[PDB]
């Protein structure tokens, strides 16, 4: 199947409470595999998946050094954003980074990313071409010009086409038991009267991996987007995810409703109903 590796940085200033906290997490698909936190007792890159534990001590020192250097860079980035936005030194601010690569079934690069946000808004983003940038505003344009002058996009491209895909390839093989196993959802429909003539049908999906799923209710074969309550897909804590979709239906009309489930772990989309 297709796979992704992503690193996410969060750098959070906190005037009066020390230097900005820097957290890195890395993911292959929906599996966290490494973390770094500048607030840890002895900040290091730490394994969070068993298949990464075999990487040698040189891997850990190199990765730790990278995060320590990036802690400094993103702290500097926070000071810089204050200037570019004419902001005071009193308020707390956040810069976030996401970068990484998507690969197809053959393991070749499908798409690379390197983008940042400031206080939850788009700041700058490497375009799909891995050669040019999109700046969200005139502040980010200053960063763009600096990155164009320094040929940052070329450096990103070399990483994204090289180490990013190569390391993700090694991780997929090392973690093939789990990273390359899809767990299909366990499904069921529950029935609960709201009142004399209204019932809630709730379509459940449990125990699935990866997180991506589609759950829809139809009434006489037509989609009920507006009338369906759909919760955000949520982590169970054992690597798997959960989701449900609910519809309120007239009593007596339960059999007009079908729940539809698509997931990578299912050979074909499922159709289920309330089964008294």
């Amino acid at each position: 199947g297709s796979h992704s590796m992503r690193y996410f940085y969060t750098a959070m200033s906190r005037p009066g409470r020390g230097e900005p906290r820097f957290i890195t997490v890395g993911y292959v698909d929906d599996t966290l595999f490494v973390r770094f936190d500048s607030d840890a007792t002895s900040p290091r890159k730490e394994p969070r998946a068993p298949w990464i534990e075999q990487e040698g001590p040189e891997y850990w020192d190199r990765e730790t050094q990278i995060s320590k250097t990036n802690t400094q860079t993103y702290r500097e980035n926070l000071r810089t954003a204050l200037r570019y936005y004419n902001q005071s030194e009193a308020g707390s601010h956040i810069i976030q980074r996401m970068y990484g690569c998507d690969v197809g079934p053959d393991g070749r690069l499908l798409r690379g990313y390197d983008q940042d946000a400031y206080d939850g808004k788009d700041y700058i983003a490497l375009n799909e071409d891995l050669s040019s940038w999109t700046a969200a505003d005139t502040a980010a344009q200053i960063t763009q010009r600096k990155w164009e002058a320094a040929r940052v996009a070329e450096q990103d491209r070399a990483y994204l086409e090289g180490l990013c895909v190569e390391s993700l390839r090694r991780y997929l093989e090392n973690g093939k038991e789990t990273l390359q196993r899809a767990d299909p959802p366990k499904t069921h429909v529950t029935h609960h009267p709201i009142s004399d003539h209204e019932v809630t049908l709730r379509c459940w999906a449990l125990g699935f991996y990866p997180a991506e799923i589609t759950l829809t209710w139809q009434r006489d074969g037509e989609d009920q987007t507006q009338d369906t309550e759909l919760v955000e897909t949520r982590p169970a804590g054992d690597r798997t995810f959960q989701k449900w979709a609910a519809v309120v239906v007239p009593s007596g009309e339960e059999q007009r409703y079908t729940c539809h489930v698509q997931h990578e772990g299912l050979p074909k989309p499922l159709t289920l109903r309330w089964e008294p």
């Binding site: 990278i66 980035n77 980074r97």
Partner: peptide, 9 residues
């Protein structure tokens, strides 16, 4: 594996 270094704004 991460890239060699991040970049200054």
């Amino acid at each position: 594996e991460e890239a060699g270094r991040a970049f200054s704004f």
